[PDB]
Write an enzyme that holds these catalytic residues in place. Sequence first.
Site, PDB file in Angstrom:
ATOM      1  N   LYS A   1      92.596   5.166  31.291  1.00  0.00           N
ATOM      2  CA  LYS A   1      93.284   6.374  31.751  1.00  0.00           C
ATOM      3  C   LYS A   1      94.668   5.982  32.240  1.00  0.00           C
ATOM      4  CE  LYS A   1      92.778   8.314  35.931  1.00  0.00           C
ATOM      5  NZ  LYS A   1      92.213   9.148  37.044  1.00  0.00           N
ATOM      6  N   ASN A   2      94.763   4.812  32.878  1.00  0.00           N
ATOM      7  CA  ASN A   2      96.029   4.340  33.432  1.00  0.00           C
ATOM      8  C   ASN A   2      97.058   3.885  32.394  1.00  0.00           C
ATOM      9  OD1 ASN A   2      95.103   4.893  36.080  1.00  0.00           O
ATOM     10  ND2 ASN A   2      94.225   2.829  36.328  1.00  0.00           N
TER      11      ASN A   2
ATOM     12  N   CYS B   1     104.457  14.339  56.299  1.00  0.00           N
ATOM     13  CA  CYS B   1     105.300  14.017  57.443  1.00  0.00           C
ATOM     14  C   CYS B   1     105.877  12.607  57.372  1.00  0.00           C
ATOM     15  CB  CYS B   1     104.516  14.176  58.757  1.00  0.00           C
ATOM     16  SG  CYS B   1     103.082  13.077  58.939  1.00  0.00           S
TER      17      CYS B   1
ATOM     18  N   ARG C   1     107.655   5.967  49.989  1.00  0.00           N
ATOM     19  CA  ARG C   1     106.741   6.945  49.426  1.00  0.00           C
ATOM     20  C   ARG C   1     106.697   6.570  47.944  1.00  0.00           C
ATOM     21  NH1 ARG C   1     103.292   8.960  52.243  1.00  0.00           N
ATOM     22  NH2 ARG C   1     103.676   6.922  53.219  1.00  0.00           N
TER      23      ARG C   1
ATOM     24  N   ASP D   1      91.296  -3.814  41.817  1.00  0.00           N
ATOM     25  CA  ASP D   1      90.355  -2.787  41.365  1.00  0.00           C
ATOM     26  C   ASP D   1      88.957  -3.318  41.005  1.00  0.00           C
ATOM     27  OD1 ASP D   1      92.081  -0.696  41.827  1.00  0.00           O
ATOM     28  OD2 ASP D   1      92.748  -0.508  39.734  1.00  0.00           O
TER      29      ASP D   1
ATOM     30  N   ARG E   1      86.119  11.210  37.840  1.00  0.00           N
ATOM     31  CA  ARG E   1      87.534  11.299  37.527  1.00  0.00           C
ATOM     32  C   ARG E   1      88.103  10.024  36.921  1.00  0.00           C
ATOM     33  NH1 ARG E   1      86.879  15.759  39.710  1.00  0.00           N
ATOM     34  NH2 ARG E   1      88.264  17.129  40.917  1.00  0.00           N
TER      35      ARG E   1
END
Length: 419
Positions: free
Chosen positions: A22-23, A115, A120, A305, A397
Site C-alpha cells: 500500500k505504501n 495545536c 509537522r 514496522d 486498513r
Amino acid sequence: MDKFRVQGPTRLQGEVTISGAKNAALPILFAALLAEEPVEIQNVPKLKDIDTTMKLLTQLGTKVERXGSVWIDASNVNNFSAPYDLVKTMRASIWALGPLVARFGQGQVSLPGGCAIGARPVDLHIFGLEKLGAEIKLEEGYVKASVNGRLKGAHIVMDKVSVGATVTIMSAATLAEGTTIIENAAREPEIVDTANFLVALGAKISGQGTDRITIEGVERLGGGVYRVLPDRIETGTFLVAAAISGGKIVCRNAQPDTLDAVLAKLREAGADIETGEDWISLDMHGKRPKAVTVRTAPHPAFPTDMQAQFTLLNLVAEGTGVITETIFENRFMHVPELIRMGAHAEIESNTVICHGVEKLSGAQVMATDLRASASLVLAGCIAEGTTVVDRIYHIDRGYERIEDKLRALGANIERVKGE
Ligand SMILES: [NH3+]C1CCCCC1
Ligand SMILES: [NH3+]C1CCCCC1
C-alpha cells in the site's frame, strides 16, 4: 466494531500470496497524475486508502477503474483542488500537490488542524516544493502552491530523512527544468518502486535506493504498465507467523531483497530459509525459535514496522532477547498486552528485555498500531485458549483480509461483528 476471535494453539503452515505494498501503491497512484497517457498499475491491494485515493483522483478529473489492477487516465485532469471531505481520513493526500503543480502549475490540498507546530509531517513537502521554485500560500487548514512557468531543478539537502517529502520532491522534479539532486534521500524500497514507475513513464532518475537521488527534468511523461512491488512488512509478518508456531511456509509473489535484515534475524532465531526470484520459504522443523537481539534503524537496516512482531517472537523464544527501538519513542504498546497473555518482559527506556516463555494464554487484547494489532492476532494463534483482539479495523486498513490468509495456514480465527 469488528473483532477477531482467535483460538490456539495452532501450527501455521502452507502458502500465502503476498499483496502489493500500500505504501508503494499510494505514491505511485498520485504520481500517475503526471501521466499524459493511460496507465495500468498492477498488483494494487484492495484497501481503504486505495479507495479514498481513487475517489480523490476522480474528483480531480482522472478516469479511474479497478478490479487486481487500477487503470488510470489522467489525460484530462481539470480540477486542481483536493477538498477536505475527500482528504480528511488520509495524510497521503499531500502527494497530490507536487504532481499538480509540476504538471499544471497550480494545486491545493486541505490539511487537518492541530495545536502543535514544528516538524509537522507536511512541512518538508512544502519547503521542498518551494526549493523547486513554487510559490506557497498557507492558511490554517490548507496549502496552495503555484509556479510561474515550470518548476526549476535544485540541489536540496534534507535535514532529516523523510519518505513522504522524498516522494514529493522526486515526483515533482521529473517535470522541472534542469537537474534536481536530493541529498539524504529516503532509501526505502517504496521510494525505489515509485522512482522506477516514474522512469517507466519517461522520467530520468538515478540513485533511487541510495542517499542521493538525481532527477533530470523532462517536458512530459507518457503512460504504460507497472506492477507495484510486494508488501515487505506483510511478508515479514507471515514469516514470523510460521517462525513462532513451529511452522513451515512459502510466501509467493515476494521480493526477498527488500527483507535482507529481517531474513538474517529469522535465521538467527533458528529458521531454515530459502529464497527464489519471487518467493521465500521458511521452515522451523517444529522447533521453538531462539531469542534474538534487534535494533531498528532506517532501511536497509531492521525495520521498525517489524519490531512488534519480533518482540512477540522473542517472548515465546528460548532465551533472553532485547529489542531496541530507535525510530519511534513510544512503540511498545503491544508489550503490556502480551504481558497479560503471560509474557515476561521488562521495559527499559527504548528497549524491551524479553524472557521467552513456552506458551501464552488467551486474553482480551487491543492495540491501535497496525503492526502491534497484527502481532496480537499472531499471539492469539499460538496462545492456549481464546484470544479476542478488539478494534481490528486497524489491521483491515493495512492488510488485505488477514484472517482469510491465516485461516489458509491453519489458524482458527473468526471475524465477530460486535460481541
Ligand atoms: N478499459 C480498461 C478498464 C477495464 C479493464 C480493461 C481495461
Ligand atoms: N484558485 C485555485 C488555487 C490552486 C488550485 C486550483 C484552484
